[PDB]
Amino acid sequence: VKKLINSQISLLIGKGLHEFDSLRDPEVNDFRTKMRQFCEEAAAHRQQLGWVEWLQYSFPLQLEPNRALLVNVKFEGSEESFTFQVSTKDMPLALMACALRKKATVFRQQPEEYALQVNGRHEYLYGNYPLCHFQYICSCLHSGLTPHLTMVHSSSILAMRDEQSNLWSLEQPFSIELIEGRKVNAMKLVVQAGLFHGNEMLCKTVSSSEVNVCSEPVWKQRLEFDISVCDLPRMARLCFALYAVVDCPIAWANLMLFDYKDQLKTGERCLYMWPSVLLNPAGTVRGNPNTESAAALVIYLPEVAPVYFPALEKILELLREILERELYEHEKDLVWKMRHEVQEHFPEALARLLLVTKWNKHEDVAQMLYLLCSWPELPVLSALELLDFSFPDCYVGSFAIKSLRKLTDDELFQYLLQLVQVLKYESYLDCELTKFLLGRALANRKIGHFLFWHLRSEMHVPSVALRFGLIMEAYCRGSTHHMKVLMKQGEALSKLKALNDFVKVSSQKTTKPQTKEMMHMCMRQETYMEALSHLQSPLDPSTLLEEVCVEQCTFMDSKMKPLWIMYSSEEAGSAGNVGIIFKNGDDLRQDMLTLQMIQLMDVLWKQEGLDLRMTPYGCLPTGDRTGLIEVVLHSDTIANIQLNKSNMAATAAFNKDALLNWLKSKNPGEALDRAIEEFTLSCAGYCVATYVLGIGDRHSDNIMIRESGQLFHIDFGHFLGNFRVPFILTYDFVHVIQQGKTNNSEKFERFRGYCERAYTILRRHGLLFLHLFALMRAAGLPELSCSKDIQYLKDSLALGKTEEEALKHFRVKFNEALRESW
């Protein structure tokens, strides 16, 4: 039984558990045994939460960042239902009290015993929150539709919970022996090396003597470093590069000088090197698992006596305002001098101080660390910055995690992508971030869900495979039931892969309608219907994908032939009609990042009461160049609409009317006005979003309208101006905002203010986007490579300017954009 769990975990994570043992590594072993006890205590805890609390775990509330409305309510084991008027201000409890008073008459005869489920979703309404604080209610309030909800009793929910049970002495300079290698090139070999603490070098880099591009090369050289061993910080990192010359990089490799047990390291080491794009401090500190093929450097760490890093007690024992809002040496000096007063009157400039403290002087570091332990907790925003690679020191990390704990799950979810990337930076397996992500993922099934996928999605990447795999195994130890739910998901994804593969070959030999019939046959196979049905959508686990409508499924006409999968739910009705797009072949990371940053803008706007009617559809990479997009129904490309087909409702004398006619036919009479509004708001939003983010090559083929008028974007290939992309006003948008008039400066300038608000709001959170992008550098995304990329943001948000200025700046670009418009 314990045996079956293991094989399930193996299949689930994409790596077999035997491989962890085969490593014969105490670091891994400890991480495994430790992290299991932890996840087991969490899982233990959970099985004894009260029912409401279990709901909170299982399906956390989805909330928005007087007026009448019709609601429909039913009770679980029955079809009969009732329609009430309520106020949008009513508590979920008031509604539940009605439900019951209605029932008990149609039946002859306590609201606290119930929670309201959304029909056909893993979504629930509970708490003291007026109805439309719940996203679902408020959402309905807009698209116009009637909320449909099911009274679920406490006995019913608890049944679910049930079914889910399971030192300073050493003064001599540091130096190593470089012995020999085993590599491939054309010319002389060289081995350069430096000691890093983050991005900063601890002293000048040193080099090898020029040998023949030959062997199996030999060196047997002392390389001595311009620093004394006693000054080596905890997180000291030794970084190698190997290249040829007579310029030409071959491989690289890094290691920590202290092991995970704080022991300094001796003596011989074989390093299996990673092939190159010279020195790479950010690169991982464990070796290339491809031992057969990979080049290897063998070194000798001299044995300086056994030595550990001193305990914390031993550590603990041992116009400035004007600058303080890059700095000269002299300034650096003043800051350091004022450290105490920094910790007293500018605690939020911590990051600035840490950047001036001398990491290659053990005495200075001890001073810095002493101030850290009395340091007041910082705001979340400051914590996100402290996770930067610039801050490799784990006492700082511990502090940053310490400050990060007051994250709401919503915030946590909103940054989860980035926190995962930072795991790639971690010098050791057992660490605080890992401990924290696991703990929060265990207290929240939604967080649990996405963490897994973020991790499961990168197992094809050898540098993170082990780390990630070990985390996923830990999590499963913490959630036997959720791992079943997830296998269901990965089983569906496996089938989709096989289906898409068939689609690629077939689509080259034959015509679309034929491949479509073939697809449906393959899908109608027993193994496919079972695999592809009755699951939770990986794009959002509260979305249930029940019955695939084979008849509706097809594939899209682009190189990779992405699949189009429609699902219905009888229990869910209309909002059980959902689609996903399976994509195998393209990298989805770029888009997912893009989609999350827009999502962020929307939350920011909404937190200041600006609702631009955005459309944040799911996008979720699941594996090697494989993931899913959320289908947005009742929409079409501008281009498609501008095919302006005769026979359709939008038959137009001039192409500029096409959109507006379409909108008219979907939105008769007084509905028309609302749709123009929806179009205007969301346009404002996507214009500002594409502009700040440097997303370009927008054309009518990658912009979509929905029948509500809402406009949104697909196919993000390029961002951060990655061919300075202008602001863009398409003539046809302007025309639609202007209600079909040549001049409508009333309508048009309202539109300007929306942009201006959206833009100005984002700037106030400029730093929040910077820190997040900072953290993304860890990803290896090709258009997220360096500083010039983070420069793009600085410039778009005109962050260094004043609001009066920036607005002025933005006003030119926006004008420039209107001029372009015919």
| Smallest separation (angstroms) from ligand ZZQ to the CB of 44 | 41
CA distances from 540 to 11, 137, 450, 537 (A): 22, 18, 9, 5
Which of these segments, 295-303, 389-397, 551-559, 735-743, binds ligand ZZQ (CB under 6 A)?
551-559
Inter-residue contact 307 to 174 (CB < 8 Å): no
Provide the minimum distance between the beta carbon of 556 and ligand ZZQ in the complex, in angstroms, as a whole number. 3
Question: At closest approach, how far in Å is the CB of 641 from ligand ZZQ?
Answer: 11
Q: Choose, by CB under 6 A, the member of 318, 564, 656, 748 that binds ligand ZZQ.
A: 564
- Distance of alpha carbon 613 from the chain centroid: 22
Contact segment (CB under 6 A) with ligand ZZQ among 53-61, 294-302, 552-560, 682-690 equals 552-560
In the complex, what is the shortest distance from the CB of residue 515 to ligand ZZQ, in angstroms, rounded to a whole number?
11
Which is closer to ligand ZZQ, CB of 356 or CB of 631? 631
What would you report as the CA-atom Rg of the chain, rounded to the nearest whole angstrom?
A: 30
Stretch that binds ligand ZZQ, among 137-145, 244-252, 599-607, 629-637 (CB under 6 A): 629-637
The C-alpha atoms of residue 709 and residue 680 are separated, in whole angstroms, by 8
Least distance in angstroms from the C-beta of 507 to ligand ZZQ: 11
Residues 6+ apart with CB under 8 A from 759: 688, 692, 807, 810
Q: Please identify, using beta-carbon distances, which residue of 485 and 632 lies nearer to ligand ZZQ.
A: 632
Closest approach of ligand ZZQ to the CB of residue 716, in Å = 11
Give the whole-angstrom CA distance, residue 21 versus residue 473: 13
Q: Point out the residue whose Cβ comes nearest to ligand ZZQ.
A: 556
- Helix crossing, 445-456 with 432-443: angle to 10°? 130
CB 272 → ligand ZZQ: shortest distance, Å? 42
CB of 616 to ligand ZZQ, least distance (A): 11
CB of 573 to ligand ZZQ, least distance (A): 21
44 touches ligand ZZQ by CB under 6 A: no
Distance, in Å, from the CA atom of 8 to the CA atom of 583, rounded to the nearest integer, reads 25
Phi-psi region of 223 (alpha: psi -120 to 50; beta: other; left: phi over 0): beta
H or E element that contains 803: helix 803-820
Q: How far apart are CA 190 and CA 244, in angstroms?
A: 6
CB neighbours of residue 224 within 10 Å: 12
The nearer residue to ligand ZZQ, 356 or 580, going by C-beta atoms, is 580
Minimum distance from CB of 581 to ligand ZZQ (Å)? 6
**Residue 557, interface with ligand ZZQ (CB under 6 A)?**
yes
Phi-psi region of 642 (alpha: psi -120 to 50; beta: other; left: phi over 0): alpha
Q: How far is the CB of 452 from ligand ZZQ (least distance, A)?
A: 23
- In the complex, the smallest distance separating the C-beta of residue 713 from ligand ZZQ, rounded to whole angstroms, is 9
Contact assessment for residue 239 and residue 297, using Cβ atoms and an 8 Å cutoff: no
Write down the least CB distance from residue 557 to ligand ZZQ, Å.
Answer: 4
Quote the CA–CA distance of 740 and 724 in Å, as a whole number. Answer: 31
d(Cα 116, Cα 625) in Å, to the nearest integer?
Answer: 39
* Piece of 463-471, 556-564, 641-649, 669-677 that binds ligand ZZQ (CB under 6 A): 556-564
Binding of ligand ZZQ by 629 (CB under 6 A): yes
Please report how close the Cβ of residue 579 comes to ligand ZZQ at its closest, in angstroms: 7
Q: Which residues, in sequence order, are bridge partners of residue 242?
A: 191, 251
* Residues 633 to 652 in contact with ligand ZZQ, rule: CB under 6 A: 635, 637
Q: Which of residues 106-145 bind ligand ZZQ (CB under 6 A)?
A: none
Please identify, using beta-carbon distances, which residue of 17 and 632 lies nearer to ligand ZZQ.
632
Write each residue from 689 to 728 as x if it is in contact with ligand ZZQ (CB under 6 A), else as -, in one continuous string: -------------------------x--------------
Helix-helix angle 394-404:432-443, to 10 degrees: 20
* CB nearer ligand ZZQ, residue 276 or residue 640: 640
User: How far, in Å, are 515, 553, 562, 639 from residue 557 at the CA level?
Assistant: 12, 13, 8, 15
Among 617, 691, 773, 792, interactor with ligand ZZQ by CB under 6 A: 617
Distances (CA, A) of 769 to 49, 442, 776, 791: 37, 27, 10, 12
Residue 748 binds ligand ZZQ, judged by CB under 6 A: no
Choose between 639 and 812: whose C-beta lies nearer to ligand ZZQ. Answer: 639
- 556 sits near ligand ZZQ (criterion: CB under 6 A): yes
Per DSSP, helices labelled H in 567-719 are 589-607, 638-642, 658-666, 671-693
Q: By C-beta, is 226 or 701 nearer to ligand ZZQ?
A: 701
Q: Is 106 exposed, middle or buried (0-12, 13-18, 19+ CB in 10 A)?
A: exposed
Q: At a CB cut-off of 8 Å and minimum separation 6, what does 87 contact? A: 66, 67, 68, 69, 131
Q: How near is the Cβ of 54 to ligand ZZQ at its closest, in Å?
A: 33
DSSP 371: H
Residue closer to ligand ZZQ (CB basis): 12 or 580? 580
Applying CB under 6 A, the span of 353-361, 488-496, 532-540, 627-635 interacting with ligand ZZQ comes to 627-635
In the window 293-352, what residues touch ligand ZZQ (CB under 6 A)?
none
* Residue pair 776/769 in contact by the 8 Å Cβ criterion: no
Answer whether the bond into residue 216 is a cis peptide, omega within 30°. yes
User: In whole angstroms, how close is the CB of 80 to ligand ZZQ at the nearest point?
Assistant: 36
How many alpha carbons fall within 13 Å on the CB side of residue 493? Answer: 28
Binding residues for ligand ZZQ, total number by CB under 6 A: 12
Could you tell me which of 714, 722, 709 has the C-alpha nearest to residue 666? 709
By CB under 6 A, residue 38 contacts ligand ZZQ:
no
User: Residue from 29, 146, 558, 815 that binds ligand ZZQ (CB under 6 A)?
Assistant: 558
Residue 560 within binding range of ligand ZZQ, rule CB under 6 A:
no
Helix or strand (DSSP H, E) at 290:
none
Annotate each residue in 416-455 with x if it binds ligand ZZQ (CB under 6 A) or - if it does not, as one string: ----------------------------------------
- Nearest distance from residue 510's CB to ligand ZZQ, in Å? 15
Contact by Cβ (8 Å): 231, 256: no
Please identify, using beta-carbon distances, which residue of 280 and 507 lies nearer to ligand ZZQ: 507
CB neighbour class for 82 (10 Å; exposed up to 12, middle 13-18, buried from 19): middle
Given 400, 483, 631, 681, the residue binding ligand ZZQ (CB under 6 A) = 631
The residue within the footprint of ligand ZZQ, chosen from 221, 266, 554, 599 (CB under 6 A), is 554
Residue 240's SS3 state is strand
Options 168-176, 276-284, 553-561, 681-689: segment touching ligand ZZQ (CB under 6 A)? 553-561
Contacts 24+ apart (CB under 8 A), 253-256: 253/287, 253/288, 253/297, 254/280, 254/281, 254/283, 254/284, 254/285, 255/285, 256/285, 256/427, 256/428
365-to-201, 218, 309, 388 alpha-carbon distances in Å: 15, 38, 13, 18
Subset of 360-389 contacting ligand ZZQ (CB under 6 A): none
Angle 306-309-314 from CA coordinates, rounded to 5°: 120
Among 632, 770, 774, 781, binds ligand ZZQ (CB under 6 A): 632
Provide the minimum distance between the beta carbon of 704 and ligand ZZQ in the complex, in angstroms, as a whole number: 6
| Residues forming beta bridges with residue 206, ordered by sequence position | 193
The footprint of ligand ZZQ (CB under 6 A) covers 554, 556-558, 564, 617, 629, 631-632, 635, 637, 714
